[PDB]
């Protein structure tokens, strides 16, 4: 149940947790 947002604008890396 986590997630970040990193460059470019469409780059989110969701974990399983």
Request: aromatic share 6%.
């Amino acid at each position: 149940g986590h997630c970040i947002q990193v460059p470019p604008m469409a780059t989110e890396i969701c974990f399983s947790d």
